[PDB]
Write an enzyme that holds these catalytic residues in place. Structure first.
Site, PDB file in Angstrom:
ATOM      1  N   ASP B  12      -3.691  -6.444  61.310  1.00 27.73           N
ATOM      2  CA  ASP B  12      -5.075  -6.492  61.726  1.00 27.73           C
ATOM      3  C   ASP B  12      -5.871  -6.476  60.507  1.00 27.73           C
ATOM      4  O   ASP B  12      -6.603  -5.325  60.338  1.00 27.73           O
ATOM      5  CB  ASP B  12      -5.431  -5.532  62.893  1.00 27.73           C
ATOM      6  CG  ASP B  12      -6.742  -5.607  63.767  1.00 27.73           C
ATOM      7  OD1 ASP B  12      -7.624  -6.345  62.749  1.00 27.73           O
ATOM      8  OD2 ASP B  12      -6.801  -5.319  64.921  1.00 27.73           O
ATOM      9  N   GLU B 104      -8.247   6.883  62.593  1.00 25.39           N
ATOM     10  CA  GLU B 104      -8.262   5.728  63.272  1.00 25.39           C
ATOM     11  C   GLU B 104      -8.183   6.056  64.833  1.00 25.39           C
ATOM     12  O   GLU B 104      -7.062   5.719  65.606  1.00 25.39           O
ATOM     13  CB  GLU B 104      -7.230   4.663  62.929  1.00 25.39           C
ATOM     14  CG  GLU B 104      -7.217   4.323  61.318  1.00 25.39           C
ATOM     15  CD  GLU B 104      -6.166   3.488  61.077  1.00 25.39           C
ATOM     16  OE1 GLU B 104      -5.477   4.002  60.092  1.00 25.39           O
ATOM     17  OE2 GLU B 104      -5.848   2.488  61.575  1.00 25.39           O
ATOM     18  N   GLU B 113      -6.753   6.765  75.210  1.00 27.82           N
ATOM     19  CA  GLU B 113      -5.821   7.735  74.663  1.00 27.82           C
ATOM     20  C   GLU B 113      -6.083   8.983  74.173  1.00 27.82           C
ATOM     21  O   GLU B 113      -5.508   9.755  73.629  1.00 27.82           O
ATOM     22  CB  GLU B 113      -4.989   6.874  73.604  1.00 27.82           C
ATOM     23  CG  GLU B 113      -4.031   5.700  74.162  1.00 27.82           C
ATOM     24  CD  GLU B 113      -3.172   4.951  72.968  1.00 27.82           C
ATOM     25  OE1 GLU B 113      -3.232   3.606  72.929  1.00 27.82           O
ATOM     26  OE2 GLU B 113      -2.588   5.708  72.399  1.00 27.82           O
ATOM     27  N   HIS B 261      -7.083  -6.515  67.314  1.00 31.25           N
ATOM     28  CA  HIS B 261      -5.907  -6.216  68.132  1.00 31.25           C
ATOM     29  C   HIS B 261      -6.502  -5.363  69.319  1.00 31.25           C
ATOM     30  O   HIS B 261      -5.756  -5.204  70.250  1.00 31.25           O
ATOM     31  CB  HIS B 261      -4.957  -5.406  67.511  1.00 31.25           C
ATOM     32  CG  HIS B 261      -4.086  -6.187  66.457  1.00 31.25           C
ATOM     33  ND1 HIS B 261      -4.317  -7.269  65.887  1.00 31.25           N
ATOM     34  CD2 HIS B 261      -2.916  -5.902  65.986  1.00 31.25           C
ATOM     35  CE1 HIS B 261      -3.585  -7.527  65.370  1.00 31.25           C
ATOM     36  NE2 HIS B 261      -2.501  -6.917  65.053  1.00 31.25           N
TER      37      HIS B 261
END
Ligand SMILES: [Hg+2]
Ligand SMILES: [Hg+2]
Lengths: 322, 322
Positions: B12, B104, B113, B261
């Site tokens: 990406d 990230e 998440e 992505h």
């Protein structure tokens, strides 16, 4: 336990159709008999047994799914023929020995997800001389050549063979990446023209098998090459048979058969083996049951005439899709 | 943690190039400073910090990706600058307080998440007047019209309205099905022409936000309608900012910017709402956290002028890719 998942399994006409076909055409195996439905997954199976005229159908029953089955049984007016017992066979209790056990326990390469063990475990509730649907499982394997698929691996892994991807040298992980990529069995379908020799068969007779048999499961092979070329790995598929009183009915996932959601499975070799027509490729395929409800796949193979060798370990836990 | 997933992240180029841009262009933030890499997502972040001239970079990574990170540290001769610490931030101990935390922590709709909670928990190791990269997170939302996507979902759910599927009535599970299908967000990109109003913005500042606190997240919205027609749902996307000392660098996920992505996300309502150009569509988006690793989202929408209401419970733990 999503309805999306259950729908997808129902949509597989070969799966759902063949299961139904096998139960209705073998009517005398179900008429006023006591059945156990341990599998499902489509959730539709204990209904087929009702349509064939079963007396009582005990249905266990995974925690989802127990409730999904409960609604449909009530809505289809069958509360008095189908009982839904939530849980699993090695955890629950039945009040009666059954005549037939039915289930959809097949994973990729038949054994993946290790559902057949629970299936074989169910025979604690089976009457003597009763039977099981499916009755047997034939695993098939054959050598294949596929340069594009083999090369595909290295093109992927070669991403790591850069000294300065954003100023970072990744090359030290290239080897680990190759290994990883080759460690995944490939799920998709293929033309039969890539098959280098006639398939050998390995047969599990569910009626006689103990559930321990599925923990090691060793498959020896001696292929006699039809074609000259490079062997890049072994192709896998499976058939199950519903051997009833009236009729034996087959569910096949062969590459010569219409496509199913099980597709076919290919395990590559890290080093391709050159073989001639008339040459013999021998070795054994070992499937060790592992802690992630899957198999560690060990493949050793040699071309008898030249003595070239590999030497390959896979984990069915992480399959590559296409 | 497979190389390959890591490779996917790296490939990406917007994501990777922007993270490098952010760090290198703000080098006075890293030069001779102590850094915490908590992601790590792609092992690569520490190396950017190293390229910027950080004195010491502690990198907390999970097991096994700690191994893969170590291999790269040794082979890139940065063993005196990057120190891999295996485990999780809410577990491990650091010998020192840090100037900057880099990570990230973004999933779909940003928050998915719940990696951000680890990210904010790391503020434990942050010096006073320290910085975080990214510094803030902007969630944008915009109402959308997409006739094709709606009936596409509805006709999949429509499977479960069926009085006789292989002789089985599924009709009673319709509504359980419709609920499930419309609970899953659609991860896809789209033409900005489908946007029926200029986006509204919800800012989460990582420098000040407590891990408390990202368990609730209430997002109000009040759109001015611009175009008449049927609002089929809400589109969501995120911008993330690196507010450094020299300059601010944005990593944008907007449908107006190049693709990432993360794509974009959409809740479609189980029932479209009609709105006219000039109208106000108000309501709240609620993001209640759950055990284990995702959100339960409650989208309450109304047209002020009518006011036609919609309430939908969307569950991130799916979703629907493409
Ligand atoms: Hg079942
Ligand atoms: Hg939404």
């Amino acid at each position: 336990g999503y309805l999306s998942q259950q729908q997808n399994m129902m949509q597989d006409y070969v799966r759902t159709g063949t299961y139904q076909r096998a139960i209705l055409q073998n009517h005398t195996d179900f008429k006023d008999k006591i059945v156990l439905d341990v599998g499902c997954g489509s959730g539709i199976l204990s209904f087929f047994a009702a349509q064939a005229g079963a007396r009582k159908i005990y249905a266990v029953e995974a925690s989802t799914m127990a409730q999904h089955a409960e609604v449909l049984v009530k809505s289809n007016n069958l509360t008095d023929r189908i009982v839904v017992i939530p849980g699993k066979v090695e955890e629950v209790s039945l009040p009666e020995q059954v005549d037939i056990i039915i289930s959809e326990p097949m994973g990729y390469m038949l054994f993946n997800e290790r559902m057949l063990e629970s299936y074989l475990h169910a025979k604690k509730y089976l009457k003597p001389s009763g039977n099981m649907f499916p009755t047997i499982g034939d695993v098939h394997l054959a050598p294949f050549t596929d340069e594009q698929l083999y090369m595909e691996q290295f093109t992927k892994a070669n991403f790591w063979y850069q000294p300065s991807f954003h100023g970072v040298d990744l090359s030290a992980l290239r080897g680990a990446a190759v290994d990883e990529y080759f460690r995944q069995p490939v799920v998709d379908t293929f033309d039969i023209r890539i098959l280098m020799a006639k398939s050998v068969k390995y047969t599990v007779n569910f009626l006689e098998a103990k559930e321990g048999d599925l923990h090691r499961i060793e498959i020896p092979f001696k292929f006699h090459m039809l074609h000259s070329g490079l062997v890049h790995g072994l192709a896998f598929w499976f058939d199950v048979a519903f051997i009833g009183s009236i009729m034996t009915v087959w569910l096949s996932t062969a590459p010569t058969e219409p496509l199913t959601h099980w597709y076919q499975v290919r395990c590559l070799f890290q080093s391709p083996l050159f073989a001639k027509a008339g040459d013999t490729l021998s070795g054994t395929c070992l499937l060790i049951a592992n802690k992630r409800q899957s198999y560690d796949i060990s493949i050793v193979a040699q071309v008898d005439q030249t003595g070239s060798k590999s030497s390959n370990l896979l984990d069915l836990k992480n399959p590559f899709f296409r």
